[PDB]
């Protein structure tokens, strides 16, 4: 029946996909061998008798991370050509990951995509997780997106992109891979979700009180975000908001599909101990700009749409009271032409808590995916980083010797600046 | 005799229709297995209005449950009183409307409505003379508001003179959910005024208000709200299934409240409605029933009747009460509150008595009232409709699959003239 096909390209895609599938196996109750000690058909197939295999591909040119996946704990949980490896890395180049070394791995990736999509008609779409600042995450991201568009046109291609966070980049050539990534995904990605490191770091700083998180601590947070969204597809609830319902209710104009995220409460043992996590309090705390997951301020941004997924023992009346209290709360302002701005959904099954992790037992949790005009600031400062990049040909000889000529940087500037003035004219 | 064929449109209509088929089932003594219990003549004296014999003794509802997703179908079946329905009456949808009026009315509603009309005519021609249909859906969704009204148009052209009663759950002024509310609502109502005999507006926040101030609930769920609507529409069809000193059917009711065929939108109130400590503290009589009925807090709709004129009205009382007191209380609410009633109709209201009360009530009453004070709903979804339409907002999820702008323009033009017809009668 209903199903989703996760795509995990880039090293960020491999590691985030590890946390998402560790969580999903923990939700439906399946061991790392795939056994049990019909609500799991969205993520897992019924292979053989009692075995369940994921609906995910791990497309990555680094063998040192995906061979290490296929030799670890879950080596029998994944079918051996779900995990797909190249030979040499793109190494933070859009050109190498899209033109030279990426064309010999897309032809094998689409073998597995078609072989898993023909399992049953009823697919909702794809959940593509990638790193924008990377080379395999962005170069192979562009090539895989356009072959998915030409073969599966009407399917809801979702994207959870690891955007380069504004002040920390862990790279130098990240503005080149990020401008060329948007030139692909404005015409390809149906729904894009802004993730970045720095906003997930400081919500681990202030809400989990962890003074040094690694990447996997970030990966638990993103795993709970995708778990709350797709919990509607797996478990029955009062308002089941599907993947198809996301793209209608959040996209007023087809070019703008860049939404920010928030997940609250995110609380450890010490501070799952002193609150009542009532719906009004955990929907205000989702709406704080500190709890944003993109390092983007809604104070100088006007809201357009706002979706709220709920899990747990959530009563609809207190949801309708709380969403009225946040409309009369006037720090956040909605745009004039869109007075109604909410799509709520309620699921009764609470998120199961990862043991040994960093979050605690929460009766009810809120995910939020909201569109605003504040996306101008997360595109303008990478514009200012890129125009001093391309001013005097820094790091250009690597890209132009790889197969694309001078000039593709220029239309990557023109269509992103067109995206800038698109966001300015909407909020007028 | 006379049968009413129920249709549940959308996931809202399925849940507020399953709540209907257990309170009618309780009223007629039917177990969820279909076996009768309760050893009284009057329960089974007219069972063919809502049920059909199955040559095994269990009664099946004349209900076509129909939707674009299997999400709420399996919840209706697995719920209590869920095995009562015939499985063949279900019409599954696999794609699911993404809360689009276009995607319901046009794209996948086309290849599914031929699979609903074949069982609707099966249930219609099965009996001798069908009285009409009742349909129950919400006007904020895609599959119920868009493709549910697609069924309404084609049952009209196939069965013209039958009564088409509609229970529409209108979108919200204040607490808006399913963000394309006015796009689904304005496109539905301009197609529904030409193809509906009776329409009854129901508002979720008015049901929330009733559950808070008059009934005093601390934990209200959707099953609470659906039971207000189901118990309200049990009183509309009491005289069809039970004897009374003064009978009233749906075609009886349509002549009363429709002076002109354009205005057919009504208010629904159910009395009595008392809380836990209050139910043993009030005197259950006619003057308090009509006083708790002719007030704003008991209306199941977010429009205040005191902000306009009650154009026509009706009250279907239930129980063994005086016919004296019913009629005198109708004269008192007109003589004292004369300013709230229009002057070119002498005795704007009427009444009926159904001798069988609801179980657990000595006496009750439902109210169906066509008022010109409901125009405030139409304007406040008009200015929300023109709020997005004026700069082409969310239109590409409607124009990309076969709907154009000039019948969007016909949508508000068929919407403002409804308000102007109400203005001239006030």
């Amino acid at each position: 029946m209903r199903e989703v096909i996760s795509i995990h390209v880039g090293q960020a895609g491999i590691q985030i996909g590890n946390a998402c599938w560790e969580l999903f196996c923990l939700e439906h109750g399946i061991q790392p061998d795939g056994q049990m000690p019909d609500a799991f058909n969205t993520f897992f197939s019924e292979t053989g008798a009692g075995k369940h295999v994921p609906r995910c591909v791990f497309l990555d040119l680094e063998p040192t991370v995906v061979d290490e996946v296929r030799t670890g704990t879950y080596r029998h949980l994944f079918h051996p050509e779900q995990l797909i490896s190249g030979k040499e890395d793109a190494a933070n180049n859009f050109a190498r990951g899209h033109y030279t070394i990426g064309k010999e791995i897309v032809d094998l990736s689409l073998d597995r995509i078609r072989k898993l999509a023909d399992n049953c008609t009823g697919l909702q779409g794809f959940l593509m997780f990638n790193a924008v600042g990377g080379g395999t995450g962005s170069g192979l991201g562009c090539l895989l997106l356009e072959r998915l568009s030409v073969d599966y046109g009407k399917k809801s291609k979702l994207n959870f992109c690891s955007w380069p966070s504004p002040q920390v980049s862990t790279a130098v050539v990240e503005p080149y891979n990020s401008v060329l990534s948007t030139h692909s995904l404005l015409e390809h990605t149906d729904v894009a979700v802004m993730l970045d490191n720095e906003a997930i770091y400081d919500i681990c700083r202030r809400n989990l009180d962890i003074e040094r998180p690694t990447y996997t601590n970030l990966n638990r947070l993103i795993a709970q975000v995708i778990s709350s969204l797709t919990a509607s597809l797996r478990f029955d609830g009062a308002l089941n908001v599907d993947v198809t319902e996301f793209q209608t209710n959040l996209v007023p104009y087809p070019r703008i599909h860049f939404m920010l995220s928030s997940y609250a409460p995110i609380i450890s043992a010490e501070k799952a101990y002193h609150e009542q996590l009532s719906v009004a309090e955990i929907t205000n705390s989702a709406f704080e700009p500190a709890s944003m997951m993109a390092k983007c301020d809604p104070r100088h941004g006007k809201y357009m749409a706002c979706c709220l997924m709920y899990r747990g023992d959530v009563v609809p009346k207190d949801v309708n009271a709380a969403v009225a209290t946040i409309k009369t709360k006037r720090t956040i302002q909605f745009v004039d032409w869109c007075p109604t701005g909410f799509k709520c959904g309620i699921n009764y099954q609470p998120p199961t808590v990862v043991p040994g992790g960093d979050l605690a037992k929460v009766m009810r949790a809120v995910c939020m995916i909201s569109n605003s005009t504040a996306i101008a600031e997360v595109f303008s400062r990478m514009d200012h980083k890129f125009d001093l990049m391309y001013a005097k040909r820094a790091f250009v000889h690597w890209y132009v010797g790889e197969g694309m000529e001078e000039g593709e940087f220029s239309e990557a500037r023109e269509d992103l600046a067109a995206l800038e003035k698109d966001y300015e004219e909407v909020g007028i | 005799m006379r049968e009413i064929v129920h249709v549940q449109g959308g996931q809202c209509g399925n849940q507020i229709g399953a709540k209907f088929w257990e309170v009618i089932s309780d009223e007629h003594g039917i177990d969820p297995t279909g076996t009768y219990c309760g050893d009284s003549d009057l329960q089974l004296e007219r069972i063919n209005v809502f049920y059909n014999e199955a040559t095994g003794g269990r009664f099946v509802p004349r209900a076509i449950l129909m939707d674009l997703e299997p999400g709420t179908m399996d919840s209706v079946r697995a719920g209590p009183f869920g095995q009562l329905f015939r499985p063949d009456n279900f019409v599954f949808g696999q794609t699911g409307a993404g809360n689009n009026w276009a995607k319901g009315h046009y794209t996948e509603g086309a290849e599914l409505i031929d699979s609903v009309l074949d069982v609707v005519r099966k249930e219609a021609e099965g009996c001798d003379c069908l009285q009409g249909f009742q349909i129950t859906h919400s006007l904020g969704g895609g599959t119920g508001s868009g493709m549910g009204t697609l069924l309404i148009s084609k049952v009209r052209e196939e069965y013209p003179d039958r009564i088409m009663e509609t229970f529409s759950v209108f979108p919200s002024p204040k607490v808006s959910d399913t963000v394309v509310e006015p796009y689904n609502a304005t496109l539905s109502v301009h197609q529904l005024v030409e193809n509906a005999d009776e329409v009854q507006v129901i508002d979720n926040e008015a049901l929330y208000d009733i559950c808070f101030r008059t009934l005093k609930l601390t934990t209200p769920t959707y099953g609470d709200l659906n039971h207000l609507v189901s118990a309200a529409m049990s009183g509309v069809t009491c005289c069809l299934r039970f004897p009374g000193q003064l009978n009233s059917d749906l075609r009886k009711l349509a002549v009363n409240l429709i002076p002109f065929p354009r205005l057919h939108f009504f208010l629904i109130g159910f009395a009595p409605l008392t809380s836990r400590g209050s139910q043993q503290y009030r005197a259950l009589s006619v003057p308090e029933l009509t006083q708790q009925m002719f007030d704003a807090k008991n209306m199941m709709c977010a429009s205040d009747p005191r902000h306009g004129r009650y154009l026509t009205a009706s009250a279907m009382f239930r129980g063994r009460m005086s016919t004296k007191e019913v009629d005198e209380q109708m004269l008192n609410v007109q003589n004292k509150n004369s300013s709230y009633f229009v002057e070119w109709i002498p005795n704007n209201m009427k009444s009926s008595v159904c001798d069988i009360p609801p179980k657990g009530l000595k006496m009750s009453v439902t109210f169906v009232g066509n008022s010109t004070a409901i125009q405030e709903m139409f304007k406040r979804v008009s200015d929300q409709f023109t709020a997005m339409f004026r700069r082409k907002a969310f239109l590409h999820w409607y124009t990309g699959e076969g709907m154009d702008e000039m019948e969007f323009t016909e949508a508000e033009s068929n919407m403002n003239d409804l308000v102007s017809e109400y203005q001239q009668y006030q």
């Binding site: - | 919840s75 609930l217 959707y222 039971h227 836990r276």
Partner: peptide
Amino acid sequence: NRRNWSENIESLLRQATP
């Protein structure tokens, strides 16, 4: 199922005997 579970109004619509 538990989407529509009214264990309080089904008994508020009958004369309670506390």
